[PDB]
Amino acid sequence: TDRVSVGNLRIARVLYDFVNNEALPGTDIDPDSFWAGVDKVVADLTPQNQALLNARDELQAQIDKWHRRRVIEPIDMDAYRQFLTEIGYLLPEPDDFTITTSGVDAEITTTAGPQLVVPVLNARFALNAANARWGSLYDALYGTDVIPETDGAEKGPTYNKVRGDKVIAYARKFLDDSVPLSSGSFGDATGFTVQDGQLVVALPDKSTGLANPGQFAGYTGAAESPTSVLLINHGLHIEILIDPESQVGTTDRAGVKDVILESAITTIMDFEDSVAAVDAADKVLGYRNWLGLNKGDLAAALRVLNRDRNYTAPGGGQFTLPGRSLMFVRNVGHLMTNDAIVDTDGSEVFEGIMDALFTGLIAIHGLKASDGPLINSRTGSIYIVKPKMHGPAEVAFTCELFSRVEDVLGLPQNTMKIGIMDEERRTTVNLKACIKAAADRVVFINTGFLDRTGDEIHTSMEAGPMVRKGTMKSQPWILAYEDHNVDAGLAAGFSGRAQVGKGMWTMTELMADMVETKIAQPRAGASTAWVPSPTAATLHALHYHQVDVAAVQQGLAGKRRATIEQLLTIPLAKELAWAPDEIREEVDNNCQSILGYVVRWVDQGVGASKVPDIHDVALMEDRATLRISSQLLANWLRHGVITSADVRASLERMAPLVDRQNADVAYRPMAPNFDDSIAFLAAQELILSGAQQPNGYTEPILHRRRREFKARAAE
């Protein structure tokens, strides 16, 4: 049946065909040697993979029981800390070291700027994401609420000159702030010229050059009347498009048509928490998109990947700039199996092992010429993000897996670099050892704060009721965790060598708020942080022109700003903390978020969705926010904050609101036949079984229920 026997493996035919016919040709890897490598790697590494997962359960069971046996008041932290040390949860911190990762591209070692995450299963989005290296500041300002729609500046079907003028003014001020003139303002410019390799800006009364002429990077067209002027600030490029004949430029005082920002410097093509992929068919769809990205020929009806950009040097020679975002791929973590391959006993193969083999194989195409130039890493690297690891031994195992894949693929050792997510507590409190375990492969650490919050709730599930979800962002543990991550990175030598990353902005319509708030991340020394869209990448790029991250990192060096005691501060709520109506709001809010995400997950296979919340804020939800919401409610049910009747009532009450919030044409209602809705029952199960899920992970239930929905839709 539908499977191909190779050693101990029974490969789903759709995957077998995909690899042989699409992924392997062009790599010089022998098909029989590849599949023999798969069989061998899977056989050799599956035992340690399973033992690691069992170690998680052993540790969690010990912590569960420890909390249940606590008599004394507030927790004795000294006792808690030595208990975590006794059981091997808290491990010794290694001696200071510097990472040795080599052959890494400048977009990662040096350039500070936005990092975009996109669901790899969506080809149109992945294409737009790869092309997001450059984006229009004007469109990002006009399209969003960064420019208020107040005083006659409202959007309409047709262009609004009042609004367009505010856009232009906003951009002119950005130029003044980023690439200052020697005297005067870009707002008063009437033209641009190059004279003796030097940019000259025409004002009404005089001319002027740059306060720092080094920021002039090039131009297009004739030096005497350029079609564009290219600036650089903090390593990020700014392009002023000069076109007096265009509509916008006809009204502009210097003919400027647009300001283009280097935006998404890197992009993470995601197989994990923003996608729903539960079998071989789903996995192949994403592998195929990843292949089209690396081969350079991905296309949708036609939209294609961009080629590099051509410029004239200030001195008159020619040069070129990367036109695409440098691509990472995020593999799944150590937990799940997938029946795309099963062994002779019918056991599913570990999906993380498969992702390393297949995404690594496909990535070879990005290292070589696309039928023009090489698509991705000019320095020879493959960039893999590995999520949800717990502790240094799990990092060491990921590195061993990459070493074995490199052997199968015939690649140099350490070709496969690792972006480490710091999004589980046992990685947080052992982060230095985790970095050291990958000292010759690591290209970033990143605080995956949403997963980290889920793991915070589950780990201390037995300790008592936790604070409400909105309170987590300001809890002591999470502030220490964010600072602890930057300290570890800089102390391991990340400045100039590897990104220090922070987390995702989820409120896709609140771009004014993002431009106001998200500047805190570069200000905290992060050389990158996550945005959900190309538009958001362009606006987040403003922050890197305001903040000199390299300076910030230099000033943070050698500091030790989080103690182990702060990292271990459990977000327990104080008693009597909430009125009944606050409890009710938190329950309704979490049930609505779960139902809104799960219904598109189970019914349509969408893993990241714009879901409005109880205050009608549009949130771009992924699986990690589902882990938080379900674990919180499970924690509140576990300690008697809420009853089973409250949960069921809230779910039933919020489900028709979700039914209505969708209406779209593919959508099917959950109300009123709740016991007939797989998606409703999945939502219920995520809550009522949440405390029994391993580390609170949602994939076991989501996968099972999505597969169930698939099986019913087929018959």
Ligand SMILES: O=C(O)/C(O)=C/C(=O)c1ccc2ccccc2c1
């Ligand atoms: O905080 C972590 O745990 C972390 O991993 C978060 C994400 O993965 C994430 C969150 C929101 C998204 C929205 C649109 C596309 C992708 C997304 C990815």
Ligand SMILES: [Mg+2]
């Ligand atoms: Mg995560």
Ligand SMILES: [Mg+2]
């Ligand atoms: Mg500066």
